[PDB]
């Protein structure tokens, strides 16, 4: 029922998985801030990356599906009355991590959803396949709010799909690093990172 809804739904990574992903994120920043291919393109990133993305989530990482504001968000009730939503509540999932991105605003991870997980998914509003926004925020610039992460990921996918993917500029240990221009960086993983999580609601 509407009034019992959560603030939002999502895949909340397990402690072990959350920490794995948190670790892997900081390595991408440690290795990105020191990659010469990035040090030249600092004019288009700014006027140490871990510190730049100093606003990090304070608990476990999670992949948001539907912001609900306790039933009073747009479409909140309808998402909740879906048979997949009320049945997969409290069930455990295995998300795939596709790439890790870095813009001058936010740093995050991209999620590729299985057809079954996509049943839980509710400008960039156009052209791309569903669930393309699916992510995990790993950091934010001091003055940037986290919802920005979803739109940068879409901005990158409108680019790679656009053809402006741009050839490889750097080889990292976990995958090849690409540079899409306006301070946007992407690490496409040689082996996708499988991360465990639970589908549930966030309360207070």
């Amino acid at each position: 029922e509407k009034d019992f809804l959560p603030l939002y739904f999502g895949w909340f990574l397990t402690k072990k998985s959350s920490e794995t992903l948190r670790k892997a994120g900081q390595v991408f920043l440690e290795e990105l801030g020191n990659h010469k291919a990035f040090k030249k393109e600092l004019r288009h990133f700014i006027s140490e990356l871990v510190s730049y993305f100093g606003k990090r989530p304070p608990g476990v990482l999670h992949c948001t599906t539907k912001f609900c504001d306790y039933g009073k968000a747009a479409g909140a009730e309808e998402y909740a009355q879906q048979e997949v939503v009320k049945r997969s509540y409290g069930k455990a999932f295995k998300l795939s991590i596709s790439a890790l991105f870095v813009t001058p605003k936010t740093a995050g991870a991209q999620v590729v959803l299985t057809d079954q997980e996509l049943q839980l998914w509710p400008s960039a509003s156009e052209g791309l396949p569903p669930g393309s926004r699916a992510h995990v925020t790993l950091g934010c610039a001091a003055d940037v709010q986290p919802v920005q992460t979803g739109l940068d990921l879409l901005d990158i996918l409108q680019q790679v799909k656009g053809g402006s993917q741009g050839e490889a500029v750097g080889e990292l240990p976990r995958g090849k690093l690409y540079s899409l221009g306006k301070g946007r960086w992407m690490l496409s993983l040689t082996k996708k990172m499988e991360v465990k999580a639970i589908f549930t609601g966030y309360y207070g």
Epitope: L7, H62, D69, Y202
Partner: nanobody, 130 residues
């Protein structure tokens, strides 16, 4: 539970105004505050926001550098310093309080969406002549 704005009125272009809300029955340690503007016929559009986590102070691109939001938690009053004001800022500036700041930021909500807020002030009328 009361948010009373104040400090609005007339000002010429380029002038400055400092709005103030006296939050009551709620505390700025638990609630983030959004300052909103409602101009004639437009919809409520967020100008600035301060959450209790202190690293969450945001500004709308229009007022990113002209305005400054702050709090004196001792006086549980929030402030909005507006510099180099233009007629396009004319509007009613309302003050909103939301206990899910910053939590919702990390779960798909935008600070400037006014729907998630929980309590709204009465609005102080601001007007930049011409």
């Amino acid at each position: 539970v009361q948010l009373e704005e104040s400090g609005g009125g007339l000002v010429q272009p380029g002038g400055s105004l400092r709005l103030s809300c006296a939050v009551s029955g709620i505390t700025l340690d638990d609630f983030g505050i959004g300052w909103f503007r409602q101009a004639p016929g437009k919809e409520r559009e967020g100008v600035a926001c301060i959450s209790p986590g202190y690293e969450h102070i945001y500004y709308a691109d229009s007022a990113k550098g002209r305005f400054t939001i702050s709090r004196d938690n001792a006086k549980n009053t929030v402030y909005l310093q507006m510099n180099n004001l233009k007629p396009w800022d004319t509007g009613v500036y309302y003050c909103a309080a939301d206990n899910d700041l910053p939590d919702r930021l990390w779960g798909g909500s935008d600070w400037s969406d006014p729907s998630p807020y929980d309590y709204w002030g009465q609005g102080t009328q601001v007007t930049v002549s011409s």
